[PDB]
């Protein structure tokens, strides 16, 4: 349930948007979720905190 929530929220906010991806892409996303789980309180905080100047999409990307 948590894995599917992360996939839906990070890639469109809808199930159809996630299904627009390929199985390989979904595998990558799910394994990144696993990475986040394994760090949890000890991993690097750049996995969820965007450093200033980063070019990747932000929270208002789909809004």
């Amino acid at each position: 349930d948590h894995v599917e929530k992360a996939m839906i929220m990070r890639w469109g906010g809808t199930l159809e948007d996630v299904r627009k991806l390929s199985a390989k892409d979904q595998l990558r996303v799910r394994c990144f979720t696993d990475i986040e789980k394994l760090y949890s309180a000890y991993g690097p905080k750049d996995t969820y905190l965007q450093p200033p100047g980063d070019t990747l999409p932000g929270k208002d990307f789909y809004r």
Binding site: L38, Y39, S40, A41, Y42, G43
Partner: protein
Amino acid sequence: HFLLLMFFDFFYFIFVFFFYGVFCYWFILFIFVFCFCLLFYVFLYLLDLFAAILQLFIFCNMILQLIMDFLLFLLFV
């Protein structure tokens, strides 16, 4: 259970993402940390095993103490 969960998370983190140090020149530090984690793992499990039974004992002892506070015993003659 909070303490167990947090320690298990730390052990998973260091075991998965820092075991490569066994092949590196700082292997002794990782081996020391890993041995410490194993020791803490065993200690936590033993402590929890003892504490669960002790807590059940105390839980029943409180109820029996309530009962005993109002019991009056006669002497056979």
